[PDB]
Nucleic acid binder design. Structure first.
Ligand SMILES: COC(=O)c1c(OC)cc2cc3c(c(O)c2c1C)C(=O)[C@]1(OC)C(=O)C=C(OC)[C@@H](O)[C@]1(O)C3=O
Ligand SMILES: [K+]
Ligand SMILES: [K+]
Ligand SMILES: [K+]
Ligand SMILES: [K+]
Ligand SMILES: [K+]
Ligand SMILES: [K+]
Ligand SMILES: [K+]
Ligand SMILES: [K+]
Ligand SMILES: [K+]
Ligand SMILES: [K+]
Ligand SMILES: [K+]
Ligand SMILES: [K+]
Ligand SMILES: [K+]
Ligand SMILES: [K+]
Ligand SMILES: [K+]
Ligand SMILES: [K+]
Ligand SMILES: [K+]
Ligand SMILES: [K+]
Ligand SMILES: [K+]
Ligand SMILES: [K+]
Ligand SMILES: [K+]
Ligand SMILES: [K+]
Ligand SMILES: [K+]
Ligand SMILES: [Mg+2]
Ligand SMILES: [Mg+2]
Ligand SMILES: [Mg+2]
Ligand SMILES: [Mg+2]
Ligand SMILES: [Mg+2]
Ligand SMILES: [Mg+2]
Ligand SMILES: [Mg+2]
Ligand SMILES: [Mg+2]
Ligand SMILES: [Mg+2]
Ligand SMILES: [Mg+2]
Ligand SMILES: [Mg+2]
Ligand SMILES: [Mg+2]
Ligand SMILES: [Mg+2]
Ligand SMILES: [Mg+2]
Ligand SMILES: [Mg+2]
Ligand SMILES: [Mg+2]
Ligand SMILES: [Mg+2]
Ligand SMILES: [Mg+2]
Ligand SMILES: [Mg+2]
Ligand SMILES: [Mg+2]
Ligand SMILES: [Mg+2]
Ligand SMILES: [Mg+2]
Ligand SMILES: [Mg+2]
Ligand SMILES: [Mg+2]
Ligand SMILES: [Mg+2]
Ligand SMILES: [Mg+2]
Ligand SMILES: [Mg+2]
Ligand SMILES: [Mg+2]
Ligand SMILES: [Mg+2]
Ligand SMILES: [Mg+2]
Ligand SMILES: [Mg+2]
Ligand SMILES: [Mg+2]
Ligand SMILES: [Mg+2]
Ligand SMILES: [Mg+2]
Ligand SMILES: [Mg+2]
Ligand SMILES: [Mg+2]
Ligand SMILES: [Mg+2]
Ligand SMILES: [Mg+2]
Ligand SMILES: [Mg+2]
Ligand SMILES: [Mg+2]
Ligand SMILES: [Mg+2]
Ligand SMILES: [Mg+2]
Ligand SMILES: [Mg+2]
Ligand SMILES: [Mg+2]
Ligand SMILES: [Mg+2]
Ligand SMILES: [Mg+2]
Ligand SMILES: [Mg+2]
Ligand SMILES: [Mg+2]
Ligand SMILES: [Mg+2]
Ligand SMILES: [Mg+2]
Ligand SMILES: [Mg+2]
Ligand SMILES: [Mg+2]
Ligand SMILES: [Mg+2]
Ligand SMILES: [Mg+2]
Ligand SMILES: [Mg+2]
Ligand SMILES: [Mg+2]
Ligand SMILES: [Mg+2]
Lengths: 114, 209, 123, 118, 56, 5
RNA sequence: AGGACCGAACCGACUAAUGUUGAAAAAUUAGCGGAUGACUUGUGGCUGGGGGUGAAAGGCCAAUCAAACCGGGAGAUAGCU
RNA sequence: ACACAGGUGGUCAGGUAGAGAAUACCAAGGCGCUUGAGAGAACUCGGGUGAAGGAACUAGGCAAAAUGGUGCCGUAACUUC
RNA sequence: AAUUCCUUGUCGGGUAAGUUCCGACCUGCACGAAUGGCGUAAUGAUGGCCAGGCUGUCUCCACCCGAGACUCAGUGAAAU
RNA sequence: CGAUGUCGGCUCAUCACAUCCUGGGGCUGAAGUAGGUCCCAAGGGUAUGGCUGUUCGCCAUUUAAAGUGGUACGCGAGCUGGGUUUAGAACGUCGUGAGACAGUUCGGUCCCUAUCUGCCGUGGGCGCUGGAGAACUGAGGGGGGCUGCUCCUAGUACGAGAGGACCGGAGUGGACGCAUCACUGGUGUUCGGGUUGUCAUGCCAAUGGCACUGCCCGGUAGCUAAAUGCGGAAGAGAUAAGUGCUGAAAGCAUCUAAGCACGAAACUUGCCCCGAGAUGAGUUCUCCCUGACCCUUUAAGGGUCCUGAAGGAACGUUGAAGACGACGACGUUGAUAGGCCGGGUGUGUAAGCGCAGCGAUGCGUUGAGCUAACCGGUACUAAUGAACCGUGAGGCUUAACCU
């Protein structure tokens, strides 16, 4: 629909970087503790990307304090302040859900050197 | 207070500056033309009849074509009536825009729900299924008992049974208006409203307060 | 999405290791406990000399779930496991002195502020 | 429910549908007109016309791709050496369906389907 | 289940009152061949809308 | 054969 | 070596579903048990009705068994419908 | 009783994989099972997948799901050794 | 207790909760020595109970793939 | 007794009120909180497990509460078959025995294609008085009605203290219901990829068939819940128990006799849906038809010629509509469906060629190639000129206007 895609275009961010699954990403998100506002960083491997325009989302997996955590970020949400690619992963698949069944040295991702 | 007739364009999302995501239905509300006005003298009740959109001239039958000509307006896709409260007055050929809702906080939206065809009692009425496996014979999604023995010896009216589901008029009440874009004839309302995309909607100011 | 018969890990040093949910409190016919819901639990496994022993019946608060929690922008946080903190039946204050693994801001309320103060991380 | 779904099951399993249309498409290329039931004709459009579009650009990659679908080198040959050159300028609509009464033995509605520039 | 009483020839006929066929409302005449045919169907000699579509 | 009263 | 083990042919029939005016007056499908032995199977023979045979269930003796089938006594008798 | 998803002894015994007469795909050879065409409701049958939980189901883990091969390591109570 | 009516005897184990299960007591209505008593490795499509694993059995059902049911043409039953 | 299937469970319920909760009151051995007892009230609501064939009951943990009964001890042409209650076997006991036990124990075939009534849905006919297309009014009928916790008022009133409100307001939950698919997910045998065995395309390379979709990994549209929007109301009328004003009969007293006022989730409205076959068949707006002639039984009469309107149906392309009918869009004066073009999405760097390596394989061309149901366009294919049904100014009586 031309009506709706116009309503969406006026909201999308114009400066989201290129990143793809297996890249290690740092995301900074706004959090609020009453009268004060902060960024906190969430860093991990991108295991999934969903490219639905304004409804685009991506999933970051990290291990923290021994526990695996996944977070699904809405890419164009103004809660996401910044996205930064720390490292590039070489992987054959669009989705890396097999990394849920792995840990330690089995969960290593080769680097996309070239 | 009168309402307006629109079309369900679809659903999308609004992000607030403080970081909330609001689901919105997009309702297109082109200029509604008043085709007839009714009063106590001629009809015994006060109402306006409106039309909207456009219709191919080859499809407008003469009984209808003469009706719009009487008003002096072009044929829309249909005709609808709205009751008038006291102190509301309109004139034939008047055009009513989405700006009507500019001061309105909540609306009621009416539409025809999507059609499910012949639905079973589990889908239509949330009946519990019977046991899958402990020796059940041919009776997994069937209704069970439909009544009582000799007394009364009949099934009561209104017994919940399978049959047509959906494809019927539904009203959703007290939806928040998120935005009016009178420059592009859009009304955005929070949440979902009945019917498929491209279906006609009637929007009225919320009756409850 | 915890329910009766669900086994949970314990996110605290109270000495329990596995607990089973036996009642979702706070409502008639209530089906599920989410993050920050109180549950009645029973201790299925414990270390030899902790503060509590096998077969005790206590309250607990859910702090992590595999189902995760939804945030106001539609984002989701999920954990690899289900975990709870054991509480006293009467006062509902924590039994353990320290907390393990992350927790979530859903607990950031005056009732559990002690857990939020002790947690290694609040997501 | 069926809302917005496409295709026809034609009272066959999926593997049989695929084989049947592969055979029938080969026939409509070999003989530029065939007689069949009206519903099968309407589905064959969605099979044969995409092959003709592919044949409009002759390459080893496309010939192997056309072979994978038809599995007949005589059909592939005719596609690239005849039909592609014919329909080079036509923007779709390579076939025509003509309704043709009812089949004697079971009263099925029959139709002819033919290539337009026969 | 099965009937407790034999239905009448009256009740039989009422049920069958909906079984009547309908004839073709009217045939069409081909603008060149002059054969009658069903609308949107080729004529028996293989004409349609005034051109010989099949040589059969 | 059947279950009898 | 073995009334040994696993497992096809072969022999059986533990569970579930289907079927129940059946595809079938005892089956089908998916699993199941034995499978060199007190095994299984082809051809022929013998035992006859208060009799046979029975690793015994009143089980089997031609879709029939606390006494087979056919014909006769015979139109048994029926204080019953 | 049927152009009946049943029953019926012997002989022959190709290739690749495999321990194999199992199983998969094929050869020689033989068939597509004697009503079809459409549509793609409830519901019945036979199957596939399933978030979180994991017997809470039920008279009962019934039925499903799961285990499943070869080589090597290792292996308790009890015992008629 | 394949035997025990009263009886869910009483005590212990197992469970948050156990009329079933296991151990023990002896008040054995109404065990008991070849119509055998009491043990017992192995074995059993044997009865009961518990645990790990697994799971649409279930909370609570959703979707999908085939055969029917539905419409059209031909043939054409039955109980009652 | 030429058969009324018999316990419990499952599914589905429906009524009473002798009220479990929520609602309104009186008295109290009622300070507050919380209780006891009685009156009114049937709108809505009214646990999950362990044991047991169980009903029940006990126990564990909840809840505002876990009501009592009727309906063939509701419900087997709706399911089960644990128990009772056939044929096998055994125990205790009784009997010489065959056998027996309102004793125990293990095993043990649950059939039916719906004619009628009833009920849930969906059509055809005719009627409503000339025909046709729309929009309504609303007699009447149905759905809905639940309730916790926190905070403020207020640590106030009350109380020695402990403890701790009424009335009123706000927020946020549980169960239930409607809608929807933007989000998070499921599915996705019609999209892409990996891979085992074997057969084939002459062979290599590349592909295709079969093996449950062979096994698997992702996934578009649609559908969908665990996902996310909304709902229960406020208000009004007349009242129940109850509380009163003025007031005699009865110089007083008295809510009642005359008169007047308050009072509940019950009743009538308010909210949502159906609805003129509402035969009592309503209303409003618009559109269409303005010819002759004969005969008999002289009428609401039959027929011949001419005429064929508005509109409808049929046919075709079809749909978020659908079992079939029906309903909606479109039919060249056209985006209805398919194809095609561009995009998006999904998968994940195709084939061929070149280079490196002994080879498996890697790298370059290359985020390439392919890509269903999606989005925006485009007459390339199919949606024909017709024909068919439907008529020709629409009874009588009376009244009021106009003539
Ligand atoms: C209370 O119990 C019953 O309600 C009941 C029952 O409930 C499931 C099943 C059956 C089953 C049967 C019988 C029953 O009596 C029976 C009864 C009473 C028979 O008598 C039978 O009838 C052909 C027969 O003639 C000879 C036989 O054994 C000698 C049986 O095997 C028989 O064949 C059969 O199937
Ligand atoms: K215990
Ligand atoms: K022999
Ligand atoms: K005899
Ligand atoms: K159909
Ligand atoms: K005894
Ligand atoms: K056995
Ligand atoms: K009787
Ligand atoms: K009360
Ligand atoms: K009281
Ligand atoms: K009530
Ligand atoms: K009842
Ligand atoms: K019963
Ligand atoms: K009956
Ligand atoms: K009747
Ligand atoms: K009601
Ligand atoms: K969705
Ligand atoms: K989806
Ligand atoms: K292959
Ligand atoms: K007085
Ligand atoms: K209320
Ligand atoms: K009417
Ligand atoms: K390449
Ligand atoms: K791509
Ligand atoms: Mg529909
Ligand atoms: Mg059966
Ligand atoms: Mg079944
Ligand atoms: Mg009656
Ligand atoms: Mg479509
Ligand atoms: Mg068929
Ligand atoms: Mg296959
Ligand atoms: Mg042996
Ligand atoms: Mg035998
Ligand atoms: Mg078998
Ligand atoms: Mg075997
Ligand atoms: Mg053995
Ligand atoms: Mg064996
Ligand atoms: Mg012999
Ligand atoms: Mg006997
Ligand atoms: Mg016999
Ligand atoms: Mg005798
Ligand atoms: Mg004599
Ligand atoms: Mg006689
Ligand atoms: Mg024969
Ligand atoms: Mg045959
Ligand atoms: Mg045969
Ligand atoms: Mg044989
Ligand atoms: Mg074989
Ligand atoms: Mg051959
Ligand atoms: Mg189907
Ligand atoms: Mg699951
Ligand atoms: Mg998945
Ligand atoms: Mg899972
Ligand atoms: Mg249980
Ligand atoms: Mg239960
Ligand atoms: Mg039990
Ligand atoms: Mg089993
Ligand atoms: Mg051991
Ligand atoms: Mg005990
Ligand atoms: Mg004992
Ligand atoms: Mg003895
Ligand atoms: Mg003796
Ligand atoms: Mg003994
Ligand atoms: Mg027929
Ligand atoms: Mg009788
Ligand atoms: Mg009362
Ligand atoms: Mg009311
Ligand atoms: Mg248990
Ligand atoms: Mg009963
Ligand atoms: Mg009954
Ligand atoms: Mg039994
Ligand atoms: Mg049984
Ligand atoms: Mg008997
Ligand atoms: Mg039955
Ligand atoms: Mg009404
Ligand atoms: Mg979508
Ligand atoms: Mg997904
Ligand atoms: Mg899949
Ligand atoms: Mg090769
Ligand atoms: Mg083959
Ligand atoms: Mg155009």
């Amino acid at each position: 629909s031309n009506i709706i895609k116009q309503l969406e275009q006026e909201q999308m961010k114009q400066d989201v970087p290129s990143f793809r699954p297996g890249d290690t990403v740092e995301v900074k998100v706004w959090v609020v503790e009453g009268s004060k506002k902060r960024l906190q960083a969430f860093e991990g491997v991108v295991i999934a990307i969903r490219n639905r325009g304004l409804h685009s989302a991506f999933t970051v997996r990290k291990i923290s304090n021994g526990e695996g955590v996944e977070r699904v970020f809405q890419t164009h949400s103004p809660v996401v302040d910044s996205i930064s690619v720390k490292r590039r992963g070489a992987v054959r698949k669009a989705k890396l859900y097999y990394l849920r069944e792995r840990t330690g040295k089995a969960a290593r991702i080769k680097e996309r050197l070239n | 207070m009168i309402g307006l007739v629109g079309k369900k364009v679809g659903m999308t999302r609004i992000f607030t500056e403080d970081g909330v995501s609001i689901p919105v239905t997009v309702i297109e509300v082109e200029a509604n033309r008043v085709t007839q006005v009714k009063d106590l003298a001629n009809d015994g009740y006060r109402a306006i009849q409106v039309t909207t959109g456009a219709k191919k001239a080859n499809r407008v039958t003469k009984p209808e074509a003469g009706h719009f000509a009487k008003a002096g307006v072009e044929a829309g896709r249909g005709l609808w009536e709205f009751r008038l409260a006291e102190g509301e007055e309109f004139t034939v050929g008047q055009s009513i825009s989405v700006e009507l809702f500019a001061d309105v906080k909540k609306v009621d939206v009416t539409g025809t729900s999507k059609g499910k065809g012949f639905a079973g009692t589990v889908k239509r009425w949330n009946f519990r299924t019977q046991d899958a496996t402990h020796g059940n014979s041919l009776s997994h999604r069937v209704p069970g008992s439909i009544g009582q023995n000799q007394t009364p010896g009949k099934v009561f009216k209104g017994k919940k049974m399978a049959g047509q589901m959906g494809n019927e008029r539904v009203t959703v009440q007290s939806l928040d208006v998120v935005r009016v874009d009178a420059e592009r004839n859009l009304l955005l309302v929070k949440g979902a409203v009945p019917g498929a995309t491209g279906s006609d909607l009637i929007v009225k100011p919320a009756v409850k307060a | 999405m915890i329910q009766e018969q669900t086994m949970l890990n314990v996110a605290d040093n109270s000495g329990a290791r596995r607990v089973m949910c036996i009642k979702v409190l706070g409502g008639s016919h209530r089906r599920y406990a989410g993050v920050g819901d109180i549950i009645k639990i029973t201790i299925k496994e414990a270390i030899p000399r902790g503060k509590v022993k096998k077969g005790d019946v206590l309250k607990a608060v859910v702090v992590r779930t595999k189902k995760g929690v939804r945030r106001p922008d539609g984002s989701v946080i999920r954990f690899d496991g289900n975990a709870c903190v054991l509480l006293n039946n009467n006062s509902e204050q924590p039994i353990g002195t320290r907390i393990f693994g992350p927790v979530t801001r859903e607990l950031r309320s005056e009732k559990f502020m002690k857990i939020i103060s002790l947690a290694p991380e609040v997501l | 429910m069926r809302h917005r779904k496409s295709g026809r099951q034609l009272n066959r399993n999926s593997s049989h549908r695929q084989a049947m249309f592969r055979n029938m498409a080969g026939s409509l290329v070999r003989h530029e007109i065939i007689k069949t039931t009206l519903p099968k004709a309407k589905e064959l459009r969605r099979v044969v016309e995409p092959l003709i579009t592919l044949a409009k650009t002759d390459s080893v990659a496309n010939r192997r791709l056309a072979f994978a679908r038809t599995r007949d080198n005589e059909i592939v040959a005719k596609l690239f050496n005849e039909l592609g050159p014919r329909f080079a300028s036509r923007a779709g609509g390579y076939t025509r369906i003509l309704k043709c009464g009812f089949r004697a033995g079971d009263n099925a509605p029959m139709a002819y389907i033919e290539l337009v520039d026969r | 289940a099965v009937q407790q009483n034999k239905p009448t020839r009256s009740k039989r006929g009422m049920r069958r009152s909906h079984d009547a066929l309908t004839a073709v409302t009217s045939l069409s005449v081909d603008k060149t061949s002059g054969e009658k045919h069903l609308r949107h169907h080729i004529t028996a000699d293989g004409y349609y809308r005034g051109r010989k579509v099949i040589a059969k | 054969a059947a279950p009898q009263k």
